Design a protein around this ligand. Structure first.
Ligand SMILES: Cc1cc2nc3c(=O)[nH]c(=O)nc-3n(C[C@H](O)[C@H](O)[C@H](O)COP(=O)(O)OP(=O)(O)OC[C@H]3O[C@@H](n4cnc5c(N)ncnc54)[C@H](O)[C@@H]3O)c2cc1C
Lengths: 461, 133
RNA sequence: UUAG
RNA sequence: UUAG
């Protein structure tokens, strides 16, 4: 609770840093959420030290008050030692004595009395300062901003945030990464207990779908389009699909691929390509662990694992169990997701069991039956997981992604009113990116725009 | 429009930490040094103060005297008149002091005495000689 | 090559 | 699909 609270407080701090101090540029480069977070954290460590220093500086000021006092009390103890002796000597002059001698006794007496209670006033002040010092020395301020154990648990909340955005926090745009928070849906988050694929399969019913057909080139012209595709099972076999319009649903990762996996003819305009470069395409992976026995708490839908280091904070930081079956589903996020793809399944499953043995006991963890490891960045039909608002980008790039292309005329001096190349998919919808419902809505949008443009919109008259 | 509670972010400090790649590290170890400079200063003064307190051991108890009580009296004896004139020569116009010497004359009677014995005791030129010290 |  |  303590760290999750500080985590949320640190995020608020970055927002303040962004909106109130215009800390959105630095060295002619945009600031990332990661940069701002380190800055905030560094200033929290600076403040902890500024308070420590202020506290010790009040002690010395108090101690130097005491030293000046003790010095006066010593030089006063001596004046009193001397005046006492002078008084005794004057008192030893036995009476009867003349009045100059009686005066001396009386005079030195109150001189001695005057000083004897200056010393008492000071010894009073002494006790005060000494006590004021035991208080300070008893109430030191905070020692560190974060213990090594704190940072580690904080890194887990960062990993969970890197997981949600499918990217390292150093890639996210400080200004814009949270633009679509306002459009969040109400209600509790849910999962599909019979598999999310039941949806696309259901949608596929009644449609003409050519599977194992990899588009290689998209030609869009004043007179129509032709799409060149090959059989993925034998890439020599070629097909030419001719049409009035093309709806491009290719993932942003594919569109980013250099050299191109899909060539556009003529080449896409710079305002389109520039947007494709600026937008981020993140990555995140999962490990499926199939056992014959449940050895975990079935009532717990999910539990975490804190990384030893900041670097490995995304490495298998979270585990799912939300299916009536002996399956654990481990999550890999942030910088880990990318690096873990260059690691064999054996090693990966190994680290999973290691972590689990350390939590449920080195004996209660059997070797799994089935295992599966996603590698979405390596998947050539995806080249990543989903889009994120990269530093240097904005919400407007999502709109540019959605703008259709109108090729110029073939015949010199002819009019070219209609478009031919349309774009949909998760990366094309400004208010609901990186989601299934966002992909869904992008589809409905272009279907309506294409129909508006080719069938005509009668409802606007 | 304000940082979260207990969160500290000034225009001044952000520009300092972001001045470069190690501007952060620099600032934080300058304070680590200043934190050491003062920590040992305190250890030093603790030792110095410990020593001084050691000297005052016993304090002034061996120098305290019974404070004899005697209550005021209206009449001025020749003895008391003479104590007063001397008290004036030494203390100037500290009436409280002069009263503490004589022992049985209130602070007011001292000022009365100043006026009453105006010239019989040449009180003015006595005070002059005091101011000359 | 948005073949002319 | 020698797209209609
Ligand atoms: C690990 C992971 C977890 C996710 N979890 C969630 C979640 O919990 N909640 C949520 O709302 N969203 C989640 N998403 C996002 C969601 O899955 C996607 O945003 C959505 O499914 C994308 O729909 P799309 O049609 O835009 O893209 P796609 O589903 O990728 O459709 C593009 C199609 O084009 C194919 N293709 C690619 N290249 C070619 C080519 N040359 N020729 C022909 N076909 C090609 C691809 O194979 C693919 O079938 C997750 C994504 C990933 C990667």
């Amino acid at each position: 609770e303590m760290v999750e609270q500080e985590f949320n407080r640190l995020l608020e701090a970055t927002s303040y840093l962004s909106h109130q101090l215009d800390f959105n540029v630095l060295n002619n480069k945009p600031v990332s959420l990661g940069q701002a977070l380190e800055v905030v954290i560094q200033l929290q460590e600076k403040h902890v030290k500024d308070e420590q220093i202020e506290h010790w500086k009040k002690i010395v000021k108090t101690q130097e008050e005491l030293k000046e006092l003790l010095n006066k009390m010593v030089n006063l103890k001596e004046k009193i030692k001397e005046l006492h002796q002078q008084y005794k000597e004057a008192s030893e002059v036995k009476p009867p004595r003349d009045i100059t001698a009686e005066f001396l006794v009386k005079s030195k007496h109150r001189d001695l009395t005057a000083l004897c209670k200056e010393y008492d006033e000071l010894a009073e002040t002494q006790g005060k300062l000494e006590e004021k010092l035991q208080e300070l020395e008893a109430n030191p301020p905070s020692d560190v901003y974060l213990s090594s154990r704190d940072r580690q648990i904080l890194d887990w909340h960062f990993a969970n945030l890197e997981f949600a955005n499918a990217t390292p926090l150093s890639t996210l745009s400080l200004k814009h990464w949270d633009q679509d928070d306002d459009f969040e849906f109400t209600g509790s988050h849910l999962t599909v207990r019979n598999g999310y694929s039941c949806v696309p399969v259901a949608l596929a019913e009644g449609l003409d779908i050519k599977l194992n057909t990899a588009v290689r080139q998209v030609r869009y012209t004043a007179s129509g389009c032709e799409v060149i595709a090959v059989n993925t099972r034998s890439t020599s076999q070629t097909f030419i699909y001719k049409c009035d319009a093309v709806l491009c649903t290719l993932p942003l990762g594919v569109l980013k691929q250099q050299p191109p996996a899909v060539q556009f003819v003529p080449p896409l305009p710079e305002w389109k390509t520039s947007a494709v470069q600026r937008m981020g395409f993140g990555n995140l992976n999962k490990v499926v662990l199939c056992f014959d026995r449940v050895f975990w708490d079935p009532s717990v839908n999910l539990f975490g694992h804190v990384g030893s280091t900041t670097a490995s904070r995304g490495e298998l930081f979270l585990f799912w169990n939300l299916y009536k079956a002996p399956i654990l589903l481990a999550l890999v996020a942030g910088e880990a997701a990318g690096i873990m793809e260059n690691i064999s399944d054996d090693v990966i499953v190994g680290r999973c069991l290691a972590i689990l043995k350390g939590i449920f006991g080195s004996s209660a963890v059997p070797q799994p039956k089935e295992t599966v490891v996603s590698r979405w960045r390596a998947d050539p039909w995806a080249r990543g997981s989903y889009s994120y608002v990269a530093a240097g980008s904005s919400g407007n790039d999502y709109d540019l992604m959605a703008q259709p292309i109108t090729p110029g005329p073939s015949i010199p001096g002819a009019p070219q009113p209609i478009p031919r190349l349309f774009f949909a998919g998760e990366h094309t919808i400004r208010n609901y990116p990186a989601t299934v419902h966002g992909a869904l809505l992008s589809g409905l949008r272009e279907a309506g725009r294409i129909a508006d443009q080719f069938l005509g919109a009668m409802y606007t008259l | 429009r304000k940082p979260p509670k207990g969160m500290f972010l000034s225009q001044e400090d952000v520009e300092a930490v972001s001045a470069n790649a190690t501007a952060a590290t620099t600032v934080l170890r300058q304070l680590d040094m200043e934190l050491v400079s003062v920590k040992r200063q305190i250890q030093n003064i603790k030792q110095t103060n410990s020593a001084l307190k050691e000297k005052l051991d016993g304090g002034i108890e061996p120098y305290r005297l019974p404070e004899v009580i005697q209550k005021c009296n209206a009449r001025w004896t020749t003895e008391e008149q003479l104590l007063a004139v001397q008290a004036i020569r030494k203390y100037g116009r500290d009436f409280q002091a002069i009263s503490d010497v004589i022992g049985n004359k209130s602070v007011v009677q001292v000022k009365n005495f100043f006026v009453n014995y105006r010239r019989r005791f040449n009180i003015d030129e006595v005070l002059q000689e005091w101011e000359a010290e």
